[PDB]
Structure 1
């Protein structure tokens, strides 16, 4: 089964971003759910097809989980209030978007991406991600 354990690949970056956001105070982090998700991603699958399937399944799940961890209104609230947003002029929407998007945060995420690309070659980032996840869970239980 040793040969079938494949590190969190691109999902390492997903978690790093989450950690960064948690640290910045933008995320309500649910430690156990994220650990379960990580466990799901680390689970040893022998077949290449199962790996593809996992990636496909993991993408929506990861997104959902990320959203859940965010302070963002549920898709239901957006759908019910979305009809009010459709009446906003394009200029207002752009203004809202520019105010909402912190270009500094985007830049940080980018820097993190480059760092991750660079570090993933030297160090097993998965080990750290899992360690931090374990640690965060322990903190929530203590």
Structure 2
């Protein structure tokens, strides 16, 4: 049958994975290739109904956010719940200074440039094929 009509690809999530690739080359990410392959497989799986596809994406957005959190070296949420008393005690200016020290504007600019490049290249190159190929290669290397 025409099951290809239900294989819509990752679409915007491509940029998502592409971002991670950069943070992999930049060393900012603790990569879990199997979880990335699981997420790609779940977002690629064909759901016959359009509403089901939309609901899957809406459910997967929090899951993708949690996976991205797990892929970085940032402190876990429980640490934030424990130290919220210390966080709130600091002044607003202190928090502004700390975050400005944290925000690496080069990575923000790289994100912007990569977003533009992805929007231009989605016309000519199948980004989903390449993203899945890179994920498979990374899993192969991390296994053998």
CA RMSD of aligned residues (A): 0.6
Residue 75 of structure 1 is matched in structure 2 by 77
Give CA-to-partner distance per residue, 1:7-44, whole Å, 9 cap, x none: 10110000000010011000010000110000000001
- The alpha-carbon deviation at position 90 of structure 1 amounts to 1.0
Match of 1:86, SS?
Answer: helix
- The alpha-carbon deviation at position 118 of structure 1 amounts to 0.4
Question: For 1:7 and 1:122, how far apart are their aligned partners in 2?
Answer: 15
Question: For 2:133 and 2:17, how far apart are their aligned partners in 1?
Answer: 12
Match of 2:89, SS?
Answer: coil
Give CA-to-partner distance per residue, 1:65-100, whole Å, 9 cap, x none: 000011011110011011101011111111001000
- The alpha-carbon deviation at position 104 of structure 1 amounts to 0.5
Question: For 2:57 and 2:143, how far apart are their aligned partners in 1?
Answer: 30
Answering whether residue 53 of structure 2 is matched by residue 60 of structure 1, we say: no
> Which runs of 5 or more structure 1 residues have no equivalent in the other structure?
none
- The alpha-carbon deviation at position 134 of structure 1 amounts to 0.2
Calculate the TM-score normalised by the size of structure 2.
0.97
> Which runs of 5 or more structure 2 residues have no equivalent in the other structure?
none
Aligned residues: 142
Structure 1 residue runs of 4+, over 4 Å off?
none
Calculate the TM-score normalised by the size of structure 1.
0.98
